[PDB]
Amino acid sequence: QISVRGLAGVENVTELKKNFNRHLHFTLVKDRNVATPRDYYFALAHTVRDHLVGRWIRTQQHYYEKDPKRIYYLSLEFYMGRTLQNTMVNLALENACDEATYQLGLDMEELEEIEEDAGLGNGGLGRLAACFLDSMATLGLAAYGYGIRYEFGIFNQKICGGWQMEEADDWLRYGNPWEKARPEFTLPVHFYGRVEHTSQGAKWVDTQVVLAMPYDTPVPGYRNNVVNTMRLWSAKAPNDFNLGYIQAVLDRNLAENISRVLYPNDNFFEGKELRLKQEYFVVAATLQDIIRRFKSSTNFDAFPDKVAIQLNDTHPSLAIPELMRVLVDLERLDWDKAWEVTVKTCAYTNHTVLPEALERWPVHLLETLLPRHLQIIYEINQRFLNRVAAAFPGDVDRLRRMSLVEEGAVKRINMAHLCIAGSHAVNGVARIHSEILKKTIFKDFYELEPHKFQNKTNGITPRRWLVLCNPGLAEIIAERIGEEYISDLDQLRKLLSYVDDEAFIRDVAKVKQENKLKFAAYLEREYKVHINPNSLFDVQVKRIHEYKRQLLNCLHVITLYNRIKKEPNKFVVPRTVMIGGKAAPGYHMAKMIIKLITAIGDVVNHDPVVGDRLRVIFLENYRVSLAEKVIPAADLSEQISTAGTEASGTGNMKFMLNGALTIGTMDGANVEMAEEAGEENFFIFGMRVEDVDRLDQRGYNAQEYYDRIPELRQIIEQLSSGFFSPKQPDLFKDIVNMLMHHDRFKVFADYEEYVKCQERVSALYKNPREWTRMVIRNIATSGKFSSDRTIAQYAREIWGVEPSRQRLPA
Amino acid sequence: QISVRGLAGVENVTELKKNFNRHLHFTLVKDRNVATPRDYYFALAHTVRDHLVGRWIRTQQHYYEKDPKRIYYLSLEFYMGRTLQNTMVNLALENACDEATYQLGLDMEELEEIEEDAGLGNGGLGRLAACFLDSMATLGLAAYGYGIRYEFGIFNQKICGGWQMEEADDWLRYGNPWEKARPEFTLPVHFYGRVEHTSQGAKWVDTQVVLAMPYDTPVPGYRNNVVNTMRLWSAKAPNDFNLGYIQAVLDRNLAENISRVLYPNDNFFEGKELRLKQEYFVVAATLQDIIRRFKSSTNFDAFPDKVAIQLNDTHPSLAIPELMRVLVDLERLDWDKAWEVTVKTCAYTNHTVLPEALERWPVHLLETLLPRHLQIIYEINQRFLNRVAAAFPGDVDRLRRMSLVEEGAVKRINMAHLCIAGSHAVNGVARIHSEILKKTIFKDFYELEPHKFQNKTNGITPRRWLVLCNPGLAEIIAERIGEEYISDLDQLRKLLSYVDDEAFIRDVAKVKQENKLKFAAYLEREYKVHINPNSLFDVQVKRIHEYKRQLLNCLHVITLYNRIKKEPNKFVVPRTVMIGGKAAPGYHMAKMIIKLITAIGDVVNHDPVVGDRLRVIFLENYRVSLAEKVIPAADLSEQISTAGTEASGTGNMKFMLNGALTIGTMDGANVEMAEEAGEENFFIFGMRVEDVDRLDQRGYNAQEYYDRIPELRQIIEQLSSGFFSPKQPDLFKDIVNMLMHHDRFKVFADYEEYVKCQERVSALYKNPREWTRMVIRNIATSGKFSSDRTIAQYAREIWGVEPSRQRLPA
Ligand SMILES: OC[C@H]1O[C@@]2(CC(c3ccccc3)=NO2)[C@H](O)[C@@H](O)[C@@H]1O
């Protein structure tokens, strides 16, 4: 149908059809008489998977022959989403498969909806890892993603009576056609035990053993025939485990629980033993695999020349003392040499500055679980503090601030401090965030080792986040400037010369309307909810958290409702306000915010006076597959975190690429987005970081805003009195109390500017031509935010490798 | 190479080779450079599996079109062993695959050794189910095996310091290429809850739900293109299960533990809740599947015309009240009609008379777990006892003897009584056993309903137990009488005309010697143990149990050793005495017997005076795959249970088919084996059932035998004094105490006759020609013991269906 989806050659279509029928018969053991849509999905998945294998085998043998420096990306989260369409896109098979299935009497888009998301992440951090894998393959890097194969990913969210309910994400129930189990490469991981000092160094003895079984998933690059590997570890009990008899076999579950479930916390540290086990599990198995591969290429001096390890936050921070353990205890290297190798191998990316998100593990937990690692951490700390004392003589408070060991009620290890000490590079994820690291939380470390600190602004892959989810937009762009931009997003700047082109203006607006119609239809079919496709689609999708200020959005919504009720016969620009996202199960306030949103919808959506002028919808079960649907349909992107709290954001970049305008604070990557597009083409409002600092010095008093803003007072009175919960008048008392007395994120302080800015949004929307021209200026300057740009920077500035767009032979 | 293994056509070999390479590439994602023997096994398995699928699909659609009466074989155990060779044999692909792999530079027999046994059974009962499935497919019956997919089958046995150690049988670790998961046919199973009586009957409410997910395995018939199904259920938690959050997901293990592990008890009842859950799990899921299939063909009058359910012992006895529950509570049939349907549908096979093996479930367990079933059982009991009271007026003791409910300290349900009441046919598994049922334990029931009681003598499949494991013997037979006997074992009678044929005598003895050499080589390669291939191979392989009297064998071994030591320079016929089998982990005495055997070996095997004249070996990890190796190598089959204790035995039949002579008591199927071959061609010794009865009336006094047999006294003195355990003098005190004071199985009573009979064995072995002539007379009369004969009898006399040898189109 459309050009960017590739060719549908006679030979290819015929071959795909026959292989489809072969898989339905031999693989699925079905015939067309009893086959269901799900069977058809699997037949298609297996057919497409077959096209990966040749490239996968030859890519890995190419790396063995060429022996390039290998990049190891360690993460506890990989938020992959669906794989079928992405694979077709990267292999140029989409049109061919569409044709093949059409000739078989099937709709491919219907089949695509059957695939479960691989939801092995919480949100932004996990999704960044996924975009990074795509970019590393597209840039021809010898890269490996290493993580945990959770049996249960991020929970499925159901809304019942306006409240969030959780259910297990049983994503493997029907099988996973993309993974290949590699039981032959199973490795042992050790826990507990004790340290024994001998004539020849320390020995870690009397341990409990859990097996790590790898599953490999192919990661195809964009049309370059490169297929890299994501290797995820699954926990297995040894066969002599606990070996009455029956109970001993049943108790194998205890060991295998390590890889059972993803911790559902976004930007929050929960210091549970099971989580610590998960972190060591991935680190220990991965490092053995790295060292094996290095030996199968004695001389560890060349280790850093052949190996780079990237730590995705502090979650895999145990890589540092584990590498030291292996080099010192097992390979018999002297400390100083082992440390040199470790530092040159490891690099650390920090993803947040929120105090409650930082990992600080109780010493007593590490003492019991990982006694040798604690000893190594103590030794690292002593040697590091000796360096600090030499550089800043007599500065005793600096020594306590910089220590890896934190004293107090319970002694803890600061894992961020461990990572900085043991890495040759430390980066933040947006310019403002990286500067905040150097000025505040890691100031002492920056003063000691300035050369270590870098910035690498986040990005998103234009394959999934444009070509896959928005083929209509991809096509109208390709018609004007060709296809090269898909792997060279900076080429979108060429669209600036079309900002006054009447045909292009029409096409951009047409594509948006089509996306909106499609999404409006999706909502009716799957959720029986009714929306006006002519209204402004006002969208805030992201995890529910106080810092992200879904509450500020709620206040604007109520403001709009109240204004309509005050003057019903006055024209307002119609809006559909959509808010979606999951709350961590133990996060009471986030769960209350969800209930508030649905409660507002209950009132607003059923008020006859409002009509189709304002609709409030909570988008249930927000996840990668839903993002791919709603983002292309959005007009307005809500990026409204308190300045200094959102390290980067990546949802923001997705909306910019897909033709939505942004209302946002100068926070995270919003700052660079506004810089790229020009501030005139962005809806910027609210406090800057400096303004937040000034308010903190003075003391934030929410009562002041309540007293001076009559429209705000009305909303608080409505919430308190039970206007949005008539049968439970005091339901939202916790929300009101927090807003009035202990709001860490200063919701009231940005209210007036926000509402004012939103009026400017509505004004522009009344002028479709000028709205679209501003959209074009956003799309055209979105190039910087390709993860290809991000990865090229990591490659050149941290890993010491050169990216390549050269094809491997097919 | 050999004729019975089929043709190796040019087209077939070329096609097998290309499909092998295809699977290695696309399925296994390997190339010849990094592939291991295990990869080669899987490539072969997938290649052979492909040949099943067409036949599997067309067989099942044939049953849908023809709508024949369906046979449902319900068992908690299916001891399948390996599948690769069996599939090749039944599809006539063995020679072709041998050629194909040979041309690829691989040895097929090496690849076959990589496959794990499917060890989903304990021994005889589970293996009978497996032979039955093979025969049902070969006889063209619309048959389905239903059971549980245990994650862990019968434990792997390791011998450490002469003691049995257990380890988990992780048989699914590398995957199972033979099964097809059918998650789309998942069914709910209910537990606990309570019974609510309404205006319209009883309702079972507030239950806990566990999901039953089916996995289908193909069961090919012998060269008839029929492929039946074995459907095994796996336990799954519902997604809202227990839905802090993390613990709730972790607690899913509790539900899924139902299908985790096989209870390792042979002929012993353990009244544990988990086992009861397993029994209901298989019954509830299976019955829903049966009823669905019946409806997809309102009128339950025709149910028994279209459905037969065979209960493999009392383990699936809950089928009776479950069927009543569904018909009465759900389908709204009146009691009397539902009962008529149930009785005509169900039939029960009893497999043992040992009191400790009979299932008697505590009422309190059924009350809590299955409240509605208990109510139904009570109602069945009341109506049944009303019938008994009408037939035998005033006989109050009969009423208490026949009751399904047993009174006492704890009230129990006698599941055997339930099965007799609710079945139209009840059978034993050998003529002597079936007669014992009518005369003793079920005498009261036989008097009430004589027409119900039948015999169906057990059998073994000649495919696995001759063609597969002993191709050399199969071939020399085929050379004389053709190939028809493989599916018509009665044709072996034609070999009687070759008992004086000098060429045949030579060939039979040659095949045995070759098998012995091969097995002697296997022992050296895998266990580094050394044996004389010229010695008499004296073999007792079976589960370790007091009733099977491995101890009697031990006494003979020590007798032989003592006689050699008394007269070292006297010639004796050299023997290799091999004993193997697993002990249930909680069975102390059986574990002690294993230690005794190894302790005897430790003394006998290292005595320089003995030399190569006597060797005692414990065969580690006896299982189906080992049986296939050792049985063809055996000269003497030990079948020495106390008369009246071994219901049938099936190992006995395996040895008879493979050219071993039998030393045995007149117990189980031994009686019919001797009848078929002629008593002159069998080494019969010891008490008959009547002699055991006489001794019991008198009172068994072991001291009498000790006092009157000097050779026996010596052995007991050796055991007691510490001759076989110098460092632990009292190690075998429990064994001596049991033998002297509480031997339920009268080991001493058969000692003299046994030793005498063994002397006659040695005498015959000195004359190779006459030994072989007697062997020929055994092989020639083994036809009755084909499971094809057994299944044909079940079909005609119980199920009301006619077997067919007609081919389905390929
Ligand atoms: O760099 C990727 C993203 O990382 C974060 C940090 C984060 C996280 C998740 C789990 C644990 C700790 C931090 N999720 O999102 C940041 O909050 C977000 O701003 C950033 O875009």
Ligand SMILES: OC[C@H]1O[C@@]2(CC(c3ccccc3)=NO2)[C@H](O)[C@@H](O)[C@@H]1O
């Ligand atoms: O019919 C098949 C076989 O059945 C038994 C009975 C049995 C068994 C196994 C588990 C639970 C209860 C009984 N295993 O073997 C009998 O002991 C054996 O004699 C017979 O050949």
